[PDB]
Design an enzyme around this catalytic site. Structure first.
Site, short mmCIF file in Angstrom:
data_model
loop_
_atom_site.label_atom_id
_atom_site.label_comp_id
_atom_site.label_asym_id
_atom_site.label_seq_id
_atom_site.Cartn_x
_atom_site.Cartn_y
_atom_site.Cartn_z
CG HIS A 160 -83.86 -61.99 -81.79
ND1 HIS A 160 -83.79 -62.44 -83.06
CD2 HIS A 160 -82.61 -61.73 -81.42
CE1 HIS A 160 -82.53 -62.37 -83.49
NE2 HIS A 160 -81.76 -61.95 -82.49
CG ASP A 161 -81.64 -58.43 -82.55
OD1 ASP A 161 -81.63 -57.89 -81.44
OD2 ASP A 161 -80.75 -59.18 -82.93
CG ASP B 86 -78.96 -63.21 -80.22
OD1 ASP B 86 -79.04 -62.86 -81.43
OD2 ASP B 86 -78.91 -62.43 -79.26
CD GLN C 156 -64.77 -63.09 -82.44
OE1 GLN C 156 -65.43 -64.14 -82.46
NE2 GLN C 156 -65.26 -61.91 -82.08
CG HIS D 150 -78.99 -61.42 -86.32
ND1 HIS D 150 -78.17 -62.38 -85.84
CD2 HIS D 150 -79.62 -60.88 -85.24
CE1 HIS D 150 -78.32 -62.45 -84.50
NE2 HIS D 150 -79.20 -61.54 -84.12
CG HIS E 187 -77.88 -56.46 -84.33
ND1 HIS E 187 -76.70 -55.95 -83.91
CD2 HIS E 187 -78.17 -57.53 -83.53
CE1 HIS E 187 -76.29 -56.65 -82.86
NE2 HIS E 187 -77.18 -57.64 -82.62
C1 LIG Z 1 -71.96 -64.01 -82.24
C2 LIG Z 1 -71.07 -63.03 -81.65
N1 LIG Z 1 -71.48 -62.20 -80.68
C3 LIG Z 1 -70.37 -61.45 -80.39
C4 LIG Z 1 -70.21 -60.44 -79.41
N2 LIG Z 1 -71.38 -60.08 -78.64
C5 LIG Z 1 -71.10 -58.93 -77.67
C6 LIG Z 1 -72.46 -58.35 -77.33
C7 LIG Z 1 -70.32 -59.27 -76.42
N3 LIG Z 1 -69.00 -59.83 -79.26
C8 LIG Z 1 -67.91 -60.18 -80.08
C9 LIG Z 1 -66.64 -59.51 -79.91
C10 LIG Z 1 -65.98 -60.14 -78.70
C11 LIG Z 1 -64.84 -59.25 -78.30
N4 LIG Z 1 -63.97 -58.68 -79.15
C12 LIG Z 1 -63.15 -57.98 -78.37
N5 LIG Z 1 -62.13 -57.16 -78.80
C13 LIG Z 1 -61.75 -57.03 -80.12
C14 LIG Z 1 -60.36 -56.45 -80.07
C15 LIG Z 1 -60.37 -55.65 -78.82
C16 LIG Z 1 -61.14 -56.53 -77.94
N6 LIG Z 1 -63.47 -58.06 -77.07
N7 LIG Z 1 -64.55 -58.89 -77.03
C17 LIG Z 1 -65.21 -59.37 -75.81
N8 LIG Z 1 -67.99 -61.19 -81.02
N9 LIG Z 1 -69.31 -61.80 -81.12
C18 LIG Z 1 -69.72 -62.82 -81.90
C19 LIG Z 1 -68.79 -63.48 -82.92
MG LIG Z 2 -80.69 -58.19 -79.71
ZN LIG Z 3 -79.87 -60.95 -82.18
#
Ligand SMILES: Cc1nc2c(NC(C)C)nc(CCc3nc(N4CCCC4)nn3C)nn2c1C
Ligand SMILES: [Mg+2]
Ligand SMILES: [Zn+2]
EC number: 3.1.4.17
Length: 313
Positions: A106-107, A217, A269, A72, A68
């Site tokens: 935005h951040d 985003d 992912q 970004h 962040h």
């Molecule tokens: C652009 C971008 N934005 C996000 C994001 N934004 C969050 C605020 C939800 N989260 C994640 C991670 C998603 C994820 N990983 C996992 N685990 C990793 C091993 C245990 C479980 N569980 N979840 C749901 N990747 N990500 C990307 C690439």
């Molecule tokens: Mg934000």
């Molecule tokens: Zn952002």
């Protein structure tokens, strides 16, 4: 007045594509942003001196966190740029002015922690702003910076146009709270399918700009596979530091934020692309056909995470 910004040839061509990566040369990001303002908005939109002063104060108010950060901000502004340039006639002069600024801002002043960590730590921001905690903060930092001497890039606007642009910026920034995205996207899906979607209805535009904000985003999932994969490293470096901070408060973090679940990343992912990213860019492409390359790139990266799970990557 007569003073274009120009980019080397590879950047001049590739900045127009949705998958463009702004590169590792930090000192070129301001010029890249001015270049995008000048083409998506005009040479006339802002006074160069004020804009430059504004960009440099915005940069100063991003922190040295893994994801962040200032890179970004400029990345999210470039995705918005590509959305605007592929949908020339769909947007007002004010929207063109507001949204690249919203994206850069935005951040602002992000600390690398989620709304939920501020609430469990009981950060003062969580008492000032009980929902969308970090996002109300980002909008408040945006107004602060707009109010510094020499930093009012909107000074040529009437009182009421100024109020409208700050209002596009507020809603655009609040919309980056992904907790709000799920419901926004559902309502947009319903409205598109029952044919009620009306771009002359301001509350409808607001929702469509909200979804654009989520799309920009999340645009890390719409890059060339090597960019996607290396950005995921930065994303998890934040999440896992937050995990550690959760365990310090005596709280098992969600698995997303637990570094002990490193080995499950490929599968995390997958859920994220199926639950969040694909539905985002699918509904975005339905409403704005020329944004389909974001959906195609997302689908390509989903298929790369599937390869990682099958041992082929
Ligand atoms: C652009 C971008 N934005 C996000 C994001 N934004 C969050 C605020 C939800 N989260 C994640 C991670 C998603 C994820 N990983 C996992 N685990 C990793 C091993 C245990 C479980 N569980 N979840 C749901 N990747 N990500 C990307 C690439
Ligand atoms: Mg934000
Ligand atoms: Zn952002």
């Amino acid at each position: 007045g007569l003073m274009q910004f120009t980019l080397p040839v590879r950047l001049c061509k590739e900045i127009e594509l949705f998958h463009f990566d702004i590169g590792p040369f930090e000192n070129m990001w301001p010029g890249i942003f001015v270049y995008m303002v000048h083409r998506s908005c005009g040479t006339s939109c802002f006074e160069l001196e004020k804009l430059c002063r504004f960009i440099m104060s915005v940069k100063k108010n991003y922190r040295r966190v893994p994801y962040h950060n200032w890179k970004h901000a400029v990345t999210v502004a470039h995705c918005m740029y590509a959305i605007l340039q592929n949908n020339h006639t769909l947007f007002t002069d004010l929207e063109r002015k507001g949204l690249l600024i919203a994206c850069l801002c935005h951040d602002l002043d992000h600390r690398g922690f989620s709304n939920s960590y501020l609430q469990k730590f009981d950060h003062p921001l969580a008492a000032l702003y009980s929902t969308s905690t970090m996002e109300q903060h980002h909008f408040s930092q945006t107004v602060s910076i707009l109010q510094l001497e020499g930093h009012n890039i909107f000074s040529t606007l009437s009182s009421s146009e100024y109020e409208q642009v700050l209002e596009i910026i507020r809603k655009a920034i609040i919309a980056t709270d992904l907790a709000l995205y799920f419901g926004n996207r559902k309502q947009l899906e319903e409205m598109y399918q029952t044919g009620s979607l009306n771009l002359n209805n301001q509350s409808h535009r607001d929702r469509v700009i909200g979804l654009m904000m989520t799309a920009c985003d999340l645009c890390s999932v719409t890059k060339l596979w090597p960019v996607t994969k290396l950005t995921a490293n930065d994303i998890y470096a934040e999440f896992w530091a937050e995990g550690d901070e959760m365990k310090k408060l005596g709280i098992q973090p969600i698995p997303m934020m637990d570094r002990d679940k490193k080995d499950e990343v490929p599968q995390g992912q997958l859920g994220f692309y199926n639950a969040v990213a694909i539905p985002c860019y699918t509904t975005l492409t339905q409403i704005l056909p020329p944004t389909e390359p974001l959906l195609k790139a997302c689908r390509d990266n989903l298929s790369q995470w599937e390869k990682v799970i099958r041992g082929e990557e």
